[PDB]
């Protein structure tokens, strides 16, 4: 088959195509509308059902509709589709090529004849209408078989033969060059770069040639066994290669009748000749198999559709998918999309799942919103912020414990004596670990600041967990929780402390009928503890504790049904501070040790933030935060928690990594105020008990000279304190520098380019309406 | 009066970061602010933004720069 | 999915963001670089400068860290690396806003990938092309950002590829401030991790296995404190390969494949990570963009797909 795209023929946006069926017995003229992809756009206008064994075909760009059709017998039927004359050679043989120039010159190739010229070119207007034979103005290629030819300019023509390539001009009988090659079939020119053409091969070796390299040797590109073979055997070849007409340095090759490869080329200049190389190969699968020839369709906005002719001769339309070429992710959780076809860039903003919902649920935008809100600076402010916004409660609980421990450290509690004991863990206090009597006596002193041999350790644990509180303040806390409205939490705390009649009193003073029913059910317990099991009531309470949704009511029913604490200490949906409180209040030494070991070994491997109450800000606390990071990708809380104890007590690289990552993220979010607050908070919390700053600070950068004695003017007046020279004044108000909340009328703004100083407010007022330094003899746009 | 950078033999990131602002972490070349107790630079806009919501040095060296730049 | 036109006259080859996330730079095969800025008011991307950069098609650009200023490392097919610095005292959309800094004319082949190093290495540069040689460029003197020295020269290929066969290269550095210098080098059908030694010369540390076809894009997940690193790879096969690396040549590192996903059934052209290493975005030959997030376990499972 042969599909040839013809230009300069339609005034409208439609594109005309000419086709030859694979049987080489028919010629069809097509009009294809590119803006509609459906097969109704492929319109068949006229058909000329004659000839037989067509070998070549061309068209005339200057004159509309004139189409030359070759034949194997030797007749060149030149006619119109949009008269009808037939010509032939002086000696009739097989026509293998054709070419129609712009002015009207029509060429011809013939087979090898020992007594005739092959390339015979004439004119349309200078041939006799009563003669079948042509009258060639110029005759070339004696004893040769022309296989393909194409018109380059209004004078020159490029030709090819069975053993040579020829670029022959009509103004000189001598050819310009003759390059020996085995690749001469189907010369096709690039519609952008006229100096490059591609020829087929006998074995299928496509080669993109250069005119100038032969004009002056080597092919510019080569491709071994790229296209189908059979060039020298069958004169009815298949046009399975096309130079692109949408963009430069691109071409398509159809392999095995099913796949189309859009080869793209790269070029460089060795400094006019561009040594080409292949960059990327884009594959596309055809809609239907057994395709012989195809052609491009230029679409709007650099689009591409393919018109293809099958082996049966049926012609359809296949589009090229808009493949995304780059999917990069922003720091603000945004997606950028570039296409392999056109130039517009797609944007997905944070503003199966939806992409917007996934990017809004990601922890990057979660951390960005928290850092904008002011997360981690003051722990009471963090707890208030969490309580004033909606799913996350264990972060609120661990920040509440951090607030309690920070209040303990700032109030002078548990920092005095020879043992620092700052932000230590409950597990650490309970385990103990240079004299045992000395540590016991300093713990006793700590108790003196504000039944069991380890009573001092239990009291330190209750001080750490924030539970050593009086009964009157317990009633005040009951009133506080009742005013808040968490009656379930208030009753849970009452059951935790053991005042069951007070729990019944608290739940009975509620506006919820469900709470009143639960109050009555719990009221069925006071005269019911001195009883065995299985009396229906404990059965109903066990079923309730199994089926109910609120975990506080679950543990209330569980303890009231069975007076044991192992069904309460292991409930995961209650606060671990409360579980530690009841375990320290009620359980024995061995039971408390087993519970502490189980809970600590659980939280260390599981990465729960509420294991920090047990383990403190220790190396084990950093291990817990590392597991939390590995579980959640939350470096913000890990940094803002590990800054409390790390530079003060233990140097570890994980805290440094978290701090650097959070600071880089704050810089990427352009949260410079939050980064500065984080830095000054690290410097505040890096002071030891003595007061020595242990955090690493940036070294000193610059100092101010006075050019006379060449020394610093301020020691780490309105005169230099060494040579007595006069300081320069502000150019606005003529007031000199003074040496010995910051207002905008105290500090000079010494530009480091022109070295001219003004006060801050004067400089801001002068540069608000100007862009030049105020001192004479300077040209420097400071601000 | 002319400003003079502290000369230190550095090799990597800190040679570039020695002459950078301590609030926005960019290079300072025009309209600076220099403290005397700690020798840390700031931009004009960076200082006029930071001292409305600040009390200490943004590099966190522990210097109250509103009261100690002299 | 609102689009904006880049204004290029031919194919846009590579687009990257800056550090702050408000600037993009677009290189293309019309020998141009256009840098867009994100408007604060209208929230619509608009051009800042549009200047012709190279003599051939530009294929890879990369921003420098803002502490070193605004520097764009452009690599093209004309055996050059060009570095561009913004001069603020010039009007917008002019063509002289980004003054040229240097040309690194030490390449004997067309480049494919250029990547700036992380900030803690200094102002280091990585350049790879079809020469098979990786050359590291260092900005030693901060007083003038116009002198760049060539220090590390490691050969990643035995011979350069043929003139007709296609080849693709992608580079990705190691954003870990408390680990030695590491670099990921995807040369044809080899994923190589190059590590800095005690002598100061890079060596072959480990090779990512698999990769039966041509490698198209490599990407290193940002280390945010986790004890394991992640490298995402998209081959000419439809495999989004996420490699897990544990590091403990001062330090040795072991490579274990975490996943091998075939939801594209084509060629994965670009695979890239997020800020925190949670969301993985991949584009394939099926015309679809797939987002990936880890489950409760560490195995990655497909999320919302953009077509
Ligand atoms: Zn003096
Ligand atoms: Zn003044
Ligand atoms: Zn001046
Ligand atoms: Zn100035
Ligand atoms: Zn600044
Ligand atoms: Zn300071
Ligand atoms: Zn200061």
Coordinates of C-alpha atoms in Angstrom, one line a residue, chain A residues 219-223 246-248 263-270 275-284 301-302 321-349 352-356 358-359 361-364 367 626 629-635 653-654 656-658 660-661 663-665 667-670 672 781, chain C residues 1-22 24 26 29 31 38 43-45 55-57 67 77-79 89 110 112 130 162-168 176-178 216 223-229 236 267 269-287 289-293 296 298 302-307:
Chain A
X219 CA 25.5 7.5 6.8
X220 CA 24.3 9.9 9.5
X221 CA 22.2 7.1 11.2
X222 CA 21.7 3.4 10.5
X223 CA 19.3 0.8 11.7
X246 CA 4.3 17.7 13.8
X247 CA 7.8 18.2 15.3
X248 CA 11.4 17.9 14.2
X263 CA 11.6 7.3 17.3
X264 CA 13.0 10.6 18.6
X265 CA 16.4 12.0 17.8
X266 CA 19.1 14.0 19.5
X267 CA 21.5 16.3 17.7
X268 CA 24.7 18.2 18.4
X269 CA 27.0 20.5 16.4
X270 CA 30.7 19.6 16.4
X275 CA 25.6 14.1 14.2
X276 CA 22.3 12.5 15.1
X277 CA 21.6 9.9 17.7
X278 CA 18.4 8.3 19.1
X279 CA 17.2 9.5 22.5
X280 CA 13.9 7.8 23.3
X281 CA 11.6 5.3 21.6
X282 CA 7.9 5.6 22.3
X283 CA 5.8 2.5 21.5
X284 CA 2.2 2.4 20.5
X301 CA -1.9 21.8 20.1
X302 CA 0.9 19.5 18.8
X321 CA -2.4 8.7 24.0
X322 CA -1.2 11.7 26.0
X323 CA 1.4 10.0 28.1
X324 CA 2.5 11.9 31.2
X325 CA 6.3 12.3 31.2
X326 CA 7.2 13.6 34.7
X327 CA 5.4 13.3 38.0
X328 CA 7.3 15.4 40.6
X329 CA 6.0 16.2 44.0
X330 CA 6.2 19.6 45.8
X331 CA 6.9 20.2 49.4
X332 CA 3.3 21.5 49.7
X333 CA 1.9 18.1 48.4
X334 CA 1.3 19.2 44.9
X335 CA 1.7 17.1 41.7
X336 CA 3.2 18.4 38.4
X337 CA 2.5 16.6 35.1
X338 CA 4.3 17.1 31.8
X339 CA 3.2 15.4 28.6
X340 CA 5.2 13.7 25.9
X341 CA 3.0 15.4 23.2
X342 CA 2.2 19.0 24.0
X343 CA 3.6 21.8 26.2
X344 CA 0.9 22.6 28.7
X345 CA 1.7 21.4 32.3
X346 CA -1.0 19.9 34.6
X347 CA -1.3 21.0 38.2
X348 CA -2.8 19.1 41.1
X349 CA -3.1 21.3 44.2
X352 CA -9.8 4.3 45.0
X353 CA -9.3 7.7 46.7
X354 CA -9.3 11.0 45.1
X355 CA -5.8 12.7 44.5
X356 CA -6.9 15.8 46.4
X358 CA -5.0 11.7 49.5
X359 CA -2.7 14.8 49.3
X361 CA -4.7 13.4 54.3
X362 CA -0.9 13.1 53.9
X363 CA 1.3 13.8 56.9
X364 CA 3.3 16.5 55.0
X367 CA 2.7 18.7 59.7
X626 CA 12.3 6.2 66.4
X629 CA 8.8 7.8 63.2
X630 CA 9.2 4.4 61.4
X631 CA 5.5 3.9 61.9
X632 CA 4.0 7.3 61.1
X633 CA 6.7 9.5 59.3
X634 CA 6.1 12.2 61.9
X635 CA 9.4 13.9 62.5
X653 CA 22.5 11.4 66.3
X654 CA 18.8 10.5 65.8
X656 CA 20.1 15.7 65.5
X657 CA 18.7 14.1 62.4
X658 CA 15.1 14.9 63.5
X660 CA 17.8 19.1 61.0
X661 CA 14.9 17.5 59.1
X663 CA 14.3 22.8 60.4
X664 CA 14.8 22.1 56.7
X665 CA 11.1 21.4 56.4
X667 CA 12.6 26.5 55.7
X668 CA 10.9 24.8 52.8
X669 CA 7.5 25.9 54.1
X670 CA 8.9 29.5 54.4
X672 CA 11.1 31.5 59.2
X781 CA 20.4 50.1 45.8
Chain C
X1 CA -6.3 19.5 37.3
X2 CA -6.0 23.0 35.9
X3 CA -3.3 23.3 33.2
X4 CA -1.1 26.2 32.2
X5 CA 0.8 26.5 28.9
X6 CA 4.6 26.6 29.2
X7 CA 4.9 28.5 26.0
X8 CA 7.7 26.3 24.6
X9 CA 7.7 25.7 20.8
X10 CA 8.6 22.0 21.1
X11 CA 8.7 19.2 23.7
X12 CA 9.2 20.0 27.4
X13 CA 11.9 17.7 28.5
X14 CA 12.2 18.2 32.2
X15 CA 10.5 20.3 34.9
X16 CA 11.7 20.7 38.6
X17 CA 10.6 22.7 41.6
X18 CA 12.7 24.9 43.8
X19 CA 13.2 24.5 47.6
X20 CA 10.4 26.8 48.6
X21 CA 7.9 25.2 46.2
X22 CA 6.9 28.5 44.5
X24 CA 9.4 25.9 38.5
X26 CA 11.1 24.2 32.3
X29 CA 14.1 21.0 23.0
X31 CA 16.9 25.4 23.3
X38 CA 3.7 31.0 41.7
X43 CA -2.7 31.7 42.4
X44 CA -2.0 31.3 38.7
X45 CA 1.5 30.4 37.3
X55 CA 22.8 25.4 21.2
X56 CA 20.9 22.1 21.3
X57 CA 18.0 20.5 23.2
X67 CA 21.4 29.3 50.8
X77 CA 22.7 17.4 24.3
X78 CA 25.5 19.7 23.2
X79 CA 28.1 18.3 25.7
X89 CA 18.2 44.5 39.3
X110 CA 25.6 14.5 25.2
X112 CA 21.1 13.3 30.1
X130 CA 26.5 8.9 27.2
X162 CA 26.0 3.0 20.0
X163 CA 24.8 5.8 17.8
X164 CA 21.5 4.2 17.1
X165 CA 20.6 2.3 20.3
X166 CA 18.8 4.3 22.9
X167 CA 20.1 5.0 26.3
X168 CA 18.8 6.8 29.4
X176 CA 20.9 12.1 54.7
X177 CA 23.0 14.6 56.7
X178 CA 24.4 12.0 59.1
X216 CA 14.3 5.5 33.0
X223 CA 15.6 10.5 55.0
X224 CA 13.5 11.9 57.9
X225 CA 15.2 10.0 60.6
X226 CA 14.1 6.4 59.8
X227 CA 16.7 3.7 60.1
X228 CA 16.2 2.5 56.5
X229 CA 16.5 4.3 53.2
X236 CA 11.4 0.2 30.7
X267 CA 7.4 1.8 30.6
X269 CA 9.0 7.1 32.7
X270 CA 9.2 9.0 35.9
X271 CA 9.0 7.9 39.5
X272 CA 9.4 10.4 42.3
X273 CA 9.0 10.8 46.1
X274 CA 7.3 13.4 48.3
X275 CA 8.8 15.7 50.9
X276 CA 8.5 13.1 53.7
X277 CA 8.9 10.0 51.6
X278 CA 5.3 8.9 52.1
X279 CA 3.6 9.4 48.7
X280 CA 5.3 7.9 45.6
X281 CA 4.1 9.2 42.2
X282 CA 4.8 7.2 39.1
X283 CA 3.8 7.8 35.4
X284 CA 3.8 4.9 32.9
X285 CA 3.1 4.1 29.3
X286 CA -0.6 3.4 30.0
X287 CA -1.3 7.1 30.3
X289 CA -0.3 8.4 37.1
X290 CA -0.4 6.2 40.2
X291 CA 0.1 7.4 43.8
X292 CA 1.6 5.0 46.3
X293 CA 1.5 4.9 50.1
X296 CA 0.2 -0.4 58.3
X298 CA 6.0 -1.5 55.3
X302 CA -1.6 1.5 45.2
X303 CA -3.8 4.5 46.0
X304 CA -5.8 6.9 43.8
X305 CA -4.8 6.8 40.1
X306 CA -4.8 9.9 37.9
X307 CA -5.4 9.2 34.2

